């Protein structure tokens, strides 16, 4: 049971690293958002002019 | 047009009440062999769900654009009642230590973290679903319009390009 609970702690220890990754996913996601929202708003300003 | 119908013509209420007791006896006779294995079937099914899936508030369906350039999966929102019970049990652990003496607020902090997470991704799920309902109505309109498009195409003999019906993928409808 000592080993079991230490393993439970190591589960948290590993899982803390896991949070980094979906953050990188959102990084790529936001850049993809960027590149075309730029053109969308820019052409909006175009036809408003 | 003026008679008593099938049920009105029945016998006097005490007599008929005896008849409903006998009714009950034969209905429960039908129940006895056939409604029995249903219970054990439910036992098996529900305790599979106990470990697996007995606790979903919202479904992880998939979300696609009509142009289908990307796919996003919705949320499997769970029932957090047991979780928040566990947090208040940690609260009770701390309060029991205090009571034996002669963190807690941090667990309440965890608790309303849990419900704010729950509710924000709940409302996210709700806007997902509303967009899906917009999608199905738009799919019906698209379907009929594109049918008329193919009718014009063949009227033009323009099977070279006729715009075609598009519906939600079963990704979006796991139900």
């Amino acid at each position: 049971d000592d080993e079991i609970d230490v393993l439970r702690t190591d589960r948290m220890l590993v899982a803390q690293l896991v949070d980094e990754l979906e953050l990188h996913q959102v990084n790529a996601l936001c850049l993809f958002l960027l590149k075309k929202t730029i053109r969308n708003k820019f052409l909006g300003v175009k036809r408003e002019e | 047009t003026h008679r008593l119908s099938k049920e009105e013509i029945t016998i006097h209420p005490q007599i008929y009440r005896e008849l409903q007791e006998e009714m009950r006896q034969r209905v429960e006779e039908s129940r006895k062999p056939t409604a029995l294995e249903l219970a054990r079937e439910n036992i098996r099914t529900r305790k599979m769900r106990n470990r697996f899936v007995d606790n979903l508030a919202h479904d992880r369906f998939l979300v696609r654009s009509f142009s289908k350039e990307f796919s996003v999966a919705s949320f499997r929102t769970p029932y957090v009642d047991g979780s928040i019970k566990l947090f208040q049990q940690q609260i009770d652990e701390l309060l029991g230590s205090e009571r034996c003496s002669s963190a807690v607020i941090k667990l309440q902090q965890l608790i309303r973290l849990e419900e704010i997470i729950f509710n924000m991704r709940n409302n996210f799920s709700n806007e997902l679903l509303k967009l899906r309902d917009e999608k199905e109505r738009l799919c019906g309109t698209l379907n009929v319009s594109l049918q008329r498009i193919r009718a014009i195409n063949e009227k033009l003999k323009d099977k070279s390009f006729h715009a075609d019906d598009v519906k939600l993928t079963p990704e979006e409808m796991p139900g």
């Binding site: 049971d1 080993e3 079991i4 609970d5 393993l7 439970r8 190591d10 589960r11 220890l13 590993v14 803390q16 690293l17 896991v18 980094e20 990754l21 990188h24 996913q25 990084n27 790529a28 850049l31 993809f32 | 099938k6 013509i9 029945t10 016998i11 006097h12 005490q14 007599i15 008929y16 005896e18 008849l19 006998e22 009714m23 034969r26 209905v27 006779e29 039908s30 129940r31 006895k32 062999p33 056939t34 409604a35 029995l36 294995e37 249903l38 219970a39 054990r40 079937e41 439910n42 036992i43 098996r44 099914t45 305790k47 599979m48 769900r49 106990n50 470990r51 697996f52 899936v53």
Partner: protein, 243 residues
């Protein structure tokens, strides 16, 4: 009188209608319960397939002897879509190639490496090093979508290494407590036999060690019907069966 019955008070049309209605009720109740069973099994098969069979690495579980309610599982894995393995192998080889290639435009020239004592609150990995522990990017060279995806799959290979190393030591713990539980069961039987020989038949449950098999530790045990969960009246009905 008891020889006089509501049936006698009836007229023959009411008798025929009531009898046929209740027999229709009987057959339809029987058949509808039967389909109730049928969709029960169908739902069970659907549940097994979609949850269990879709998973590659299955949801095994630990429960400690002193903590019968605390559980430890090996980590989830779906059966791979072939892009998984194709990616894994092709990317690891061409990513060694990418280590050696030194091609693209680099933004790291502006920044010089320095030191910080603690940075964020501490995190740490377990077990042997991964390959990706040697195979990560730099901090500034990742500024394009495809390189970000390659970093995503590098982190996925990190995910794989951590889940594996965790789960191999997890299963090694499984095997150790398995041999301990086998020997504990044998010793418990020996102690029961000795106590019954001595005449101390009232052995408390605290003397024999806890055989804590949580049913979810081997989750297919949780599939079953536990007829203890059957309603006692339905159990009494089931007793009259001969099989």
């Amino acid at each position: 009188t008891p020889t006089v019955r509501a049936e006698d008070f009836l007229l023959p049309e009411q008798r025929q209608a009531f009898n046929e209605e209740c027999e229709m009720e009987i057959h339809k109740a029987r058949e509808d319960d039967y389909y109730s069973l049928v969709h029960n099994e169908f739902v069970q098969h659907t549940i097994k397939t979609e949850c269990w069979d879709v998973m590659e690495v299955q949801r095994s579980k630990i429960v400690s002897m002193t903590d019968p309610e605390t559980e430890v599982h090996n980590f989830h894995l779906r059966k791979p879509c072939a892009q998984r393995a194709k990616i894994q192998k092709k990317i690891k080889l061409m990513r060694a190639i990418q280590i050696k290639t030194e091609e693209c435009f680099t933004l790291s020239s502006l920044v010089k490496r320095a030191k910080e004592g603690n940075l964020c609150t501490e995190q740490q990995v377990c077990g042997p090093p991964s390959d990706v522990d040697e195979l990560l990017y730099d901090t500034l060279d990742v500024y394009t979508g495809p390189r970000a995806t390659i970093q995503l799959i590098l982190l996925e290979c990190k995910i794989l290494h951590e889940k594996k190393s965790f789960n191999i030591r997890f299963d090694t713990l499984r095997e150790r407590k398995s041999r301990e539980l086998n020997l504990i069961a044998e010793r418990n039987g020996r102690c029961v036999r000795i106590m019954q020989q001595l005449g101390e038949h009232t052995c408390p449950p605290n003397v024999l060690f806890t055989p804590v098999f949580d049913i979810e530790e081997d989750p297919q045990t949780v599939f079953e019907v536990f007829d203890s969960e059957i309603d006692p009246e339905l159990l009494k009905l089931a007793v009259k069966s001969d099989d």
